[PDB]
């Protein structure tokens, strides 16, 4: 019976999903997902320590005094373990 | 001398400035960012082992054969070692 239409309906049905399961597997390995959430980290640890440098720095100078230079990055760190 | 203007000047830009790092801190631990990379990761997953599943009922079926079935999971596989 022409039902050998059903099977080779859902064969290519199959086969065109497939297609679909491909792309979004593409879409995935080709994300730069991770990457994008790791340079961010990486702009933010930077940003952090250029102003840690400008802290040391004006302690050396006299502008803080060591307890306030030591509160600035106390006060860094704190943050950054929540 | 004022010069203590400027020294006043200097403590408080770093203090804002430590507000600014402690903002780029917070919003970067608040970040959801590697979450929704995974939870797409885990979309795929779901996805792919949902259509997999069709093809192995397929075969069972006598819709595809064995070689057939075998071959699109082959694909599949493939496709995720790239």
């Not at 064969?11 to 730069?32: C, F, H, T």
């Not at 720095?57 to 929540?82: F, K, V, W």
């Amino acid at each position: 019976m022409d039902e050998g239409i059903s099977k080779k309906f859902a064969i290519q049905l199959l086969e065109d999903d497939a297609e679909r399961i491909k792309m979004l597997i593409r879409n995935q390995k080709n994300s730069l997902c991770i990457s994008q959430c790791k340079a961010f980290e990486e702009v933010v640890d930077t940003q952090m320590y250029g102003f840690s440098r400008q802290v040391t720095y004006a302690t050396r100078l006299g502008i803080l005094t060591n307890d306030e230079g030591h509160r600035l990055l106390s006060d860094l760190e704190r943050e950054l373990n929540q």
